[PDB]
Amino acid sequence: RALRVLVNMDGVLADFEGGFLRKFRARFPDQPFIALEDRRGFWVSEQYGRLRPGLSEKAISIWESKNFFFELEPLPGAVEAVKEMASLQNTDVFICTSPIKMFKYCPYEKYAWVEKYFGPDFLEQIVLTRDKTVVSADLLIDDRPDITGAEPTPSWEHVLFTACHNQHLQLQPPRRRLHSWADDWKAILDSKRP
Amino acid sequence: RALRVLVNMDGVLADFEGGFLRKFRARFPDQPFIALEDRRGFWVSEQYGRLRPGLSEKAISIWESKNFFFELEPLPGAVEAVKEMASLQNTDVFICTSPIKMFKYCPYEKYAWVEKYFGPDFLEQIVLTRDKTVVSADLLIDDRPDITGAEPTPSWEHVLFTACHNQHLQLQPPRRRLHSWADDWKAILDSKRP
Ligand SMILES: Cc1cn([C@H]2C[C@H](O)[C@@H](COP(=O)(O)O)O2)c(=O)[nH]c1=O
Ligand SMILES: Cc1cn([C@H]2C[C@H](O)[C@@H](COP(=O)(O)O)O2)c(=O)[nH]c1=O
Ligand SMILES: [Mg+2]
Ligand SMILES: [Mg+2]
Ligand SMILES: [Mg+2]
Ligand SMILES: [Mg+2]
What is the required cofactor set for this protein (chains A, B)? Predict the structure, then answer.
């Protein structure tokens, strides 16, 4: 009976794109890179591998490194918005996030990051999964255009969170965006309430 | 269109009760303990705290310790059964597990344990969450009697996996058990298929 909202972590709460670019340039100063304006498509590794041989593996090495996830900066407005959202009557918020294959640091640091920005009690709201379609809710706010998995008819409406890699994408109606946390997220939530 | 089954980790795949008792007795040999036959109720910490002052905190210290989760032994038949189950046509298996509050080791070691017993490709099937009711499926096989959360009407049927702490519990019809992995799990799955 409470509206349930899944909020994606990387590219929505945490600035994966910015953190990755900064750390890639610092580690690999002699390699070419993709400026954020020129990012296209969800997969960083795939765009970097097209740029040249061996860059896909070098990109992956950034996010496999210790401290990568933990040191991501929150996207503007994200912490404030999600705190407000969670505090709303008849509204339950979960943070829904996919870990990488290499599991040494990523799960741990994601829990640490949520504690850092939202406090210990918000840890109970984390769902770590590679398949978001088996998580049920009214809304999923997520920067990845193509969200698929084991469930062919997910219960949520996917609202596309704007990111550098998707900002030029024309969606099929009635697919809808949340343009940033400065955009009117309350209106989107209210549109799904009884 | 594929039957989806959530399989709980602790108390179903991994022998939490046995591992905990062994490590508690080794660390705290001068303290009283609860033999598995005498376990009642999901919460170990709560039964130990009733046994005496300070034992709840000493129990918690076992599973907060490094290597606790990783070193759990699989329950008899569990690895074999889940491998077979996953390989069945029109059947998708996810491992659905709740982490502790202290996140330094538990998420990491749970991923490590799944890799160890099921292989790298099975990592994609893990769902870490404190709330199982927001995970949608046809079945949930889980040793905890009371499974509640944000979703008042979960999409799964909860089948109670027998454990020392629940073996004496009379369930309200039509609630049903899977008595061990030697019991006929295929019959339970088939009962939910079209
Ligand atoms: C951009 C990118 C992210 N990832 C991982 C990083 C995060 O663990 C996961 C985040 O996905 P999500 O934002 O859909 O939850 O995707 C890759 O493995 N390769 C990539 O190219
Ligand atoms: C028995 C017990 C388990 N736990 C934790 C251990 C596991 O992380 C989690 C397993 O729960 P689950 O088997 O329902 O997924 O419960 C406690 O925090 N206190 C306890 O007394
Ligand atoms: Mg994302
Ligand atoms: Mg609320
Ligand atoms: Mg369990
Ligand atoms: Mg299968």
Answer: Mg(2+)
Q: Which of B10, B44, B114, B128 to mutate to test the pocket of ligand 2 (most atoms within 8 A of CB)?
A: B10
- Ion ligand 6: protein residues whose beta carbon lies under 5 Å: B 91
Is B127 an interface residue toward A (CB < 8 Å)? yes
Q: Which amino acid is at B36?
A: L
Number of domains in chain B: 2
Pocket test for ligand 1, best of A12, A16, A129 (most atoms within 8 A of CB): A16
Declared resolution, Å: 1.8
DSSP code, position B109? H
Last residue of a domain, one of A70, A87, A110: A70
Same domain membership, residue A125 and residue A45? no
**Of B117, B147, B121, residue with least CA distance to A130:** B121
Which residue has the least CA distance to atom 13 on ligand 1? A10
- By what method was this entry solved? X-ray
Please tell me whether residues A28 and A62 are part of one structural domain.
Answer: yes
Q: Which domain holds residue B63?
A: 16-70
